[PDB]
Design a protein around this ligand. Structure first.
Ligand code: GDP
Ligand code: ALF
Ligand code: MG
Length: 317
C-alpha cells in the first residue's frame, strides 16, 4: 500500500530537519507542548555550543579579551547538561559576555578546526529572547535545534492522494551499519549531502574531509545491486551555509580539482553537483539533484512538489 523511502546521508547532513519539514507541511504542525519541550532542547544546544567553543579556545590557547568573563568561562566548564534544567540568570549574562567577546568570536570564525553546530549563530543572534523566561520558540527555532538521531525511525506519512512512508536513519559511521534492515523494499532513495561539509572534517574522524566520506557513501549506495530498480534523488542541502563558506573559504584548498573562479556560489554548487553525479558507475542510471535548504520551508515545499511527482511517475503500481 504505502511506499517505503529512505533518507540517507552522513551525520549532521540534515535528514531529521527534512523529516521535520515534511511533517510540518504534509503532516501535523508542532503543538504548544512540543515547543515547551523544545525549549529545553534549545537550552542544552546553546550550553553544548558554549562548552565546545570554550574547549576549542583552550586547546587552541587563544587569549581572552575580558578577564572577568574568564571566571564565567570556568563556570561554563562546570556546567553539566546531564542534570540539566531551564536557563538561569547567572548564566545568561555570562553567555552574552562571552559571545560579545571578540576573541571567542574570532575562535568561532575559525570554527573549521573543531566540531560545532551550524545553529550557533542563529541562537547567538536570538540571545535574550531565547534565554528569556517567556520562551515561545517559533517553527524556525524548533527546526534549528540539533538532536543526534540514532537507530531506524520509520515515519509514516501520506501525500494528498498517495501514502509514502519515510525512514530516518543516523549518519554517524558507527550507526550506518544498522541500515542493513531498512533496504528490504526501497522504492526510492533520497540522499542528503551538506554543501558546506567541504570545509569541516568528520566528527568520528579528525583527518578525513566530510565531503570525501559523503562521496564514498554515495558511491557505495549507488553500487548496491538491489537498488537498480529504485530511483535516487540527491538533495544538496545547506546551500545557505555554502554561499557564505565559499565567500570565506577557498574550495581549492579542500578539493584542488575545482579550478573554477572563486567566490562564485553557483559555480561551486555546480562543481559539487557534477562531482557527485560522476560517482555513478553506469550512465544509463539517472540521478536527480535539487539544491535546497531544510531550514527554509518554501524550498522544501518546492522541492517536494516535484519529488513526489517524480516518485509517482517512477512507480506506476
Ligand atoms: N542553516 C541550515 N541548517 C541546517 C540545514 N539543514 C540542517 N541544518 C541543521 O543541522 C543540524 C543537524 O542536522 P540533523 O537534523 O542532525 O540532520 P541528520 O544528521 O541527518 O539527522 C540541525 O540542527 C539543523 O538545524 C540547512 O539547510 N540550513
Ligand atoms: F548526524 Al545525525 F541524526 F544528526 F545522524
Ligand atoms: Mg537525525
Amino acid at each position: 500500500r504505502e511506499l517505503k523511502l529512505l533518507l540517507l546521508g552522513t551525520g549532521e547532513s540534515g535528514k531529521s530537519t527534512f523529516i521535520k519539514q515534511m511533517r510540518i507541511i504534509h503532516g501535523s504542525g508542532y503543538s504548544d507542548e512540543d515547543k515547551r519541550g523544545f525549549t529545553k532542547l534549545v537550552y542544552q544546544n546553546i550550553f553544548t555550543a558554549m562548552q565546545a567553543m570554550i574547549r576549542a579556545m583552550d586547546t587552541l590557547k587563544i587569549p581572552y579579551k575580558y578577564e572577568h568573563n574568564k571566571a564565567h568561562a570556568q563556570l561554563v566548564r562546570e556546567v553539566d547538561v546531564e542534570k540539566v534544567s531551564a536557563f538561569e540568570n547567572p548564566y545568561v549574562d555570562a553567555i552574552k559576555s562571552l559571545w560579545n567577546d571578540p576573541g571567542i568570536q574570532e575562535c568561532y570564525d575559525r570554527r573549521r578546526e573543531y566540531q560545532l553546530s551550524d545553529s550557533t549563530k542563529y541562537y547567538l543572534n536570538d540571545l535574550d529572547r531565547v534565554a528569556d523566561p517567556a520562551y515561545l520558540p517559533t517553527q524556525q527555532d524548533v527546526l534549528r535545534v540539533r538532536v543526534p538521531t540514532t537507530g531506524i525511525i520509520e515515519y509514516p506519512f501520506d501525500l494528498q492522494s498517495v501514502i509514502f512512508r519515510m525512514v530516518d536513519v543516523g549518519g554517524q559511521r558507527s550507526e550506518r551499519r544498522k541500515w542493513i534492515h531498512c533496504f528490504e523494499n526501497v522504492t526510492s532513495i533520497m540522499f542528503l549531502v551538506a554543501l558546506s561539509e567541504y570545509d569541516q572534517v568528520l566528527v568520528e574522524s579528525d583527518n578525513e574531509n566530510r565531503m570525501e566520506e559523503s562521496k564514498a557513501l554515495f558511491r557505495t549506495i549507488i553500487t548496491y545491486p538491489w537498488f537498480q530498480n529504485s530511483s535516487v534523488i540527491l538533495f544538496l542541502n545547506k546551500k545557505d551555509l555554502l554561499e557564505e563558506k565559499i565567500m570565506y573559504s577557498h574550495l581549492v584548498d579542500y578539493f584542488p580539482e575545482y579550478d573554477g573562479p572563486q567566490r562564485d556560489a553557483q559555480a561551486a554548487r555546480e562543481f559539487i553537483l557534477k562531482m557527485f553525479v560522476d560517482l555513478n558507475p553506469d550512465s544509463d542510471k539517472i540521478i536527480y539533484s535539487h539544491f535546497t535548504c531544510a531550514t527554509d520551508t518554501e524550498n522544501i515545499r518546492f522541492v517536494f512538489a516535484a519529488v513526489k511527482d517524480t516518485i509517482l511517475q517512477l512507480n506506476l503500481k
